[PDB]
Swiss-Prot record, chains A, B:
Gene: mamM
Residues the record lists as binding Fe cation 3: H76
Free-text disruption phenotype from the record: Single gene disruption has no growth defects, no accumulation of magnetite, forms empty intracellular magnetosome vesicles, decreased levels of MamB, mislocation of MamC in 1-3 foci or rarely in a shortened chain. Magnetosome vesicles are fewer and smaller, aligned in a chain with the filament, only a few have very small crystals. Other, possibly precursor magnetosome vesicles are visible. MamI mislocalized to cell inner membrane or in 1 to a few patches.
Organism name: Magnetospirillum gryphiswaldense (strain DSM 6361 / JCM 21280 / NBRC 15271 / MSR-1)
Identification of the protein by name: Magnetosome protein MamM
Coverage span on the entire protein: 215 to 292 of 318
Binding site for Fe cation 1: D36, H72
Length: 79, 79
């Protein structure tokens, strides 16, 4: 699991507009991972931009870690 | 293991100068992976350049897949 969490954080951090991973909770449901995360974003990004960054994180993380079958990504102002 | 082999191939293919993965054999030794691979390279690269590409593949693949504890990379002319 720690190897999986490290991969999730690394994948998320490589997406344009991510200012770190604030929170990540991952759980196994069988052999699948279900995860919930919060990313940091520029406080001056629009809410629509933050939504786009979250969607990009979801695509990036699910594309790179095939065992993830549910991923929720939300955003919070940081830096 | 197939998930691991897919990650090895994908990581190798993203290194400048790799013209596909020609061969990959991976084995578990305990929880560790030992692997041997052959990459394709430009036939007009020098032997020194091919050596540099192999070393770059080794770094890239070992950096991305933490369970690998031995990786040998060789090169063959392709395309
Ligand atoms: Ni949308
Ligand atoms: Ni050298």
């Amino acid at each position: 699991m720690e190897a999986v969490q490290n991969r999730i954080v690394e994948a998320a951090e490589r997406v344009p507009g991510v200012r770190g991973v604030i929170h990540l909770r991952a759980r196994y449901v069988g052999q699948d991972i279900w995860a919930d995360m919060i990313i940091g974003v520029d406080p001056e990004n629009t809410v629509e931009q933050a939504h786009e960054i979250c969607e990009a994180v979801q695509a990036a993380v699910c594309g790179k870690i095939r065992r993830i079958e549910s991923l929720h990504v939300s955003a919070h102002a940081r830096e």
